[PDB]
A and B are shown apart, each in its own frame.
Chain A
Amino acid sequence: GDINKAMFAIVSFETCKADLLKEKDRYHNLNKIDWQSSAPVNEPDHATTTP
């Protein structure tokens, strides 16, 4: 019943490649990402208003 006692929290958000490239040093393994296969249409769990 207390948020401060929670062990973990997991969030799903939408980004593009330019957003990740805004801070290049922060992220690794960008070249292995499959941008076609991880579209919002593939993942049903994420709830969004995007067509």
Chain B
Amino acid sequence: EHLSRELMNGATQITEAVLQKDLLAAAGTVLYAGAATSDATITGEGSTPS
């Protein structure tokens, strides 16, 4: 019983994480805080931190 319960909890967690990552990757309107224009530009140090 314990093994089956843990198996099912793992399955639900995995499927929810899979949905969330697809949602994040398929975003249409994207804003970068600060002066960044790409994922590589985000920086926490400088005149304008992101």
Interface, chain A (partner B; CB < 8 A): 37, 41-42, 44
Number of A-B contacts (CB under 8 A): 6
CB neighbours (8 Å) of A44 from chain B are: 4
Interface residues of B in 13-46 (CB under 8 A from A): none
Which applies to chain A's interface (DSSP): helix, strand, loop or mixed?
loop
Interface range for B: under 10
Which applies to chain B's interface (DSSP): helix, strand, loop or mixed?
helix
Give bound CA distance, A41 to B10, whole Å.
Answer: 13
Are B4 and A37 in contact, CB atoms less than 8 angstroms apart? Answer: no
A-B contacts, 6 of them at CB < 8 A, read A37-B5, A41-B8, A42-B4, A42-B5, A42-B8, A44-B4
Nearest-neighbor residue (CB-CB) of B8 within chain A:
A42
Interface string of B1-13 (1 = CB under 8 A from A): 0001100100000
Give bound CA distance, A42 to B5, whole Å.
Answer: 6
